[PDB]
Amino acid sequence: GSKVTLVKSRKNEEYGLRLASHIFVKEISQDSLAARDGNIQEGDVVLKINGTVTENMSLTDAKTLIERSKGKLKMVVQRDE
Amino acid sequence: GSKVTLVKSRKNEEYGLRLASHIFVKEISQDSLAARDGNIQEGDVVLKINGTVTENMSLTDAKTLIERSKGKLKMVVQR
C-alpha cells in the first residue's frame, strides 16, 4: 500500500533499491510568468534548467540555476507521453 | 521533451516557480528483497525512510539513511 518494510537476513545482502532524486514544481504563483505561460503545471518534474540536467541535483543547486538565469529560463519538463 | 521558456522583460517580474525535490525509486534489482516485497515499485516516491521525512533531502543524505539502516528499512511510498 504505502508502508513497506524490507529486512536483511545476512550482512551484505542488498535491499535491491537504487534511489534518485527529481526536482519538481511545488507551486506556481499567481500573476507570474509561469502562470501566464501555462505550459508548466504544479507537480511537473523539471528535467533540465538552461541546459543543465537536474536529476540527482540538490534543491539548493536547482534554485541557484534559476537565480543565475539572467531573465531567460529554458526548462525541459518530463513527459510520460 | 516538453520545452518551456519564460522571459522577463520588465522590472518586478517573477518566474513564479517554487521548486521542491523528491526521492524516488530509480531501479529495483531483479530477485532482490525489494522485488519480492511487492509493495514497492519503480518510479515510486519515497516519503519517509526509517522515520525521517525525505522531501527536499539530497540524494547523498537519503543514501546515508539507507547506509545506516542496520538491515531494516521501513519506508512509506507513494504511487
Side-chain angles (χ1 to χ4, degrees), chain A residues 5-26 28-38 40 42-72:
Chain A
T5 303
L6 303 178
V7 321
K8 289 177 182 177
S9 299
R10 318 200 169 210
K11 187 72 164 299
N12 270 144
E13 201 178 350
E14 298 195 5
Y15 288 120
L17 290 179
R18 178 174 254 151
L19 299 188
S21 76
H22 270 158
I23 297 297
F24 72 99
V25 184
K26 185 85 208 148
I28 291 177
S29 318
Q30 181 184 314
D31 177 33
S32 64
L33 294 169
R36 284 207 82 174
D37 180 75
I40 186 161
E42 294 172 357
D44 278 348
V45 172
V46 182
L47 289 180
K48 297 184 48 207
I49 293 169
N50 284 336
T52 294
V53 290
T54 59
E55 191 160 326
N56 297 348
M57 178 173 291
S58 83
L59 176 54
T60 292
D61 280 341
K63 293 176 174 179
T64 294
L65 295 172
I66 300 189
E67 191 263 354
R68 285 176 192 181
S69 60
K70 294 166 206 303
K72 173 155 138 190

Side-chain angles (χ1 to χ4, degrees), chain A residues 2 4 8 15-16 24 29 71 75, chain B residues 4 8 16 20 29 69 71 75 77:
Chain A
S2 19
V4 185
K8 289 177 182 177
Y15 288 120
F24 72 99
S29 318
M75 283 167 305
Chain B
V4 187
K8 295 182 180 177
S29 300
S69 62
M75 301 165 292
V77 295

